[PDB]
């Protein structure tokens, strides 16, 4: 896999963001993560997390996996990096998202995400606070 340049157009919510990619404005859906919707418990937190992380990042990068690059809605499917830090992993580590089911072979960072998740769960962070 390889990281590619992208530019923030607009933060959306926990697992989606509007970015410019190769000159085209696109909606990207974060691979392997499921964040609560905005008007759902932990949704405002998840949205504020990604917003802050991406809005203050000098360099935004997109890394497509080995599987399907776009879903049925035309959204780009990738691992998003803000100044070298993976947004997907950062969310799961904070207990603001759970690892999602693999979508069409995009599973390269599945173990890494599961490890970020396990630690969040062990620390009873946010979504895991009722375990």
Swiss-Prot record:
UniProt binding sites for Ca(2+): 15, 34-35
Subcellular localization, as worded in the UniProt entry: Secreted
Active site: 29, 37, 75
Biased amino acid composition, Basic and acidic residues: 109-125
Residue numbers spanned by region Disordered: 109-131
Protein name in the entry: Nuclease A
Organism encoding this protein: Staphylococcus aureus
Lineage: Bacteria, Bacillati, Bacillota, Bacilli, Bacillales
